[PDB]
Every structure is written in structure tokens, then in C-alpha cells.
Amino acid sequence: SGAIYVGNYRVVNRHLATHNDWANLVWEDSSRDLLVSSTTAQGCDTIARCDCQTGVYYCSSRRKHYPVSFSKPSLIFVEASEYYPARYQSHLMLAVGHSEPGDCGGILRCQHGVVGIVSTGGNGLVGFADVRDLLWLDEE
Ligand SMILES: CN(C)Cc1ccc(C#N)cc1
Ligand SMILES: [Zn+2]
Structure with a gap:
């Protein structure tokens, strides 16, 4: 498990994305195994x-x-x-x-x-x- 927290984005493996990720979706690509969702707090x-x-x-x-x-x-x-x-x-x-x-x-x-x-x-x-x-x- 794990994510990248950049700005107001959470970058996760698409196959590990949660329902909350999908409900806050920014971008996803199955061929890359990536999904990005929006976050309330900014990341490090x-x-x-x-x-x-x-x-x-x-x-x-x-x-x-x-x-x-x-x-x-x-x-x-x-x-x-x-x-x-x-x-x-x-x-x-x-x-x-x-x-x-x-x-x-x-x-x-x-x-x-x-x-x-x-x-x-x-x-x-x-x-x-x-x-x-x-x-x-x-x-x-
Ligand atoms: C479980 N093995 C048969 C390989 C595999 C694993 C996961 C998925 C999905 N989705 C498809 C295929
Ligand atoms: Zn470099």
C-alpha cells in the first residue's frame, strides 16, 4: 500500500483505489495502474x-x-x-x-x-x- 501526496492530489495504484478515491476522482488510467483523487489537506x-x-x-x-x-x-x-x-x-x-x-x-x-x-x-x-x-x- 501507499500513495503520493502532492498538492491537493492523492496518487494511488488504480487497483488499490478506494470508493472515496473514485468519488473524488481527478484522473485514472488502467494501462498505467494509476488513479489520482482530490484531497482536503495539502501533501508533503x-x-x-x-x-x-x-x-x-x-x-x-x-x-x-x-x-x-x-x-x-x-x-x-x-x-x-x-x-x-x-x-x-x-x-x-x-x-x-x-x-x-x-x-x-x-x-x-x-x-x-x-x-x-x-x-x-x-x-x-x-x-x-x-x-x-x-x-x-x-x-x-
Ligand atoms: C488471480 N489470478 C488468476 C490472476 C489475476 C489476478 C487478478 C485479476 C483481476 N482483476 C485477474 C487475474
Ligand atoms: Zn531525478
Whole structure:
């Protein structure tokens, strides 16, 4: 579990969005596994605006942050998980690391701020849904 709290936005994995998220919906994309809802209180996170390929992510199933190198966001085939079938996911970055279903929502961060959230796992990789292209998160 986990979210990004930027401005008056909450960014969550679409597959973990709540009824309140859907009732306060800003934007969602199944192909990216992302959903954004509106919040009453402003949040503490800053979104990275960069093309870094190195950062640190939080792994809840290890209670640990790990430094990783990761691929640039792309359209990638993802094998079946507990929460999605085997399918293509867009805007997905991969690193070598540990990721189980409940790790979804852990933050990946670089020197510029939040890069994305854990979205995929298995076979010794962790996949992250990028948010650096969502420039509208920084205003309004
Ligand atoms: C449970 N396994 C059969 C894979 C899977 C997991 C979740 C969903 C959804 N929705 C679809 C398929
Ligand atoms: Zn960066």
C-alpha cells in the first residue's frame, strides 16, 4: 500500500483505489495502474521532473529502502499477478529488486523528488508506475 501526496492530489495504484478515491476522482488510467483523487489537506511530496535512472524505493515486504537503477518508462508485458492478468502496462520502469503485491504504492525517489510508485513485481524485478510526465500534478 501507499500513495503520493502532492498538492491537493492523492496518487494511488488504480487497483488499490478506494470508493472515496473514485468519488473524488481527478484522473485514472488502467494501462498505467494509476488513479489520482482530490484531497482536503495539502501533501508533503514533490514530484520529480527529470529523466533520472537511479533512485531509492521503499519495499514494505522487507521494511527496507533500496538504491536501484531503473529503465526509462515504457510499454512492457507484465505476467499475471494476484491483482492483474498478464497484460501490457504503459509508463512502466523496471529495476532488479524485490516486489510482492502488497509492496504496491511504495515510493521511488531521485534527487528531484518522487519518480513513481511500485506497481509490478515477480521474477526478481520491481516495476514502478512513472508520474514524472504528469506535469498537472504540480498545480491547481
Ligand atoms: C488471480 N489470478 C488468476 C490472476 C489475476 C489476478 C487478478 C485479476 C483481476 N482483476 C485477474 C487475474
Ligand atoms: Zn531525478
